[PDB]
Write a protein that binds this ligand. Sequence first.
Ligand SMILES: COc1ccc(Br)cc1S(=O)(=O)Nc1cccc(N2CCCC2=O)c1
Length: 127
Amino acid sequence: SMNPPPPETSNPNKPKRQTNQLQYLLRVVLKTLWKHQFAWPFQQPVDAVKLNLPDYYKIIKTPMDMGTIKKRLENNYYWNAQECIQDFNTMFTNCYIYNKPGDDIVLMAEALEKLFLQKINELPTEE
Ligand SMILES: COc1ccc(Br)cc1S(=O)(=O)Nc1cccc(N2CCCC2=O)c1
């Protein structure tokens, strides 16, 4: 009960589109970060029970993780690339809010974010 319902990965009344940029976000950006040695804490919603983080969802009220983003991309949840990019940024931002600079989890987020930005820098112009 300490864990909230996970963020939705489908929403039938939400509008969505498929674009070459969203395809790139799944095939390149998500794939790259997913396979990284530092991906594992971010591959699923924070489990405040398993990880003994009872304060986590008192502090982080807009949770996000790459497991959710992966399913959202696979399920064509997004209207555009910016919506997806926002989810990645929410995930990083949450980490920096909850944890202390220089913590192991923050070092991992920072490495992933660096890679993220490198991949985003090559995002193709739309169509
Ligand atoms: C002592 O616990 C750890 C130490 C270092 C690492 Br790396 C991971 C863990 S953990 O995954 O067992 N627990 C843990 C603790 C604090 C923050 C986060 N997370 C996960 C993603 C977002 C976020 O804030 C998880």
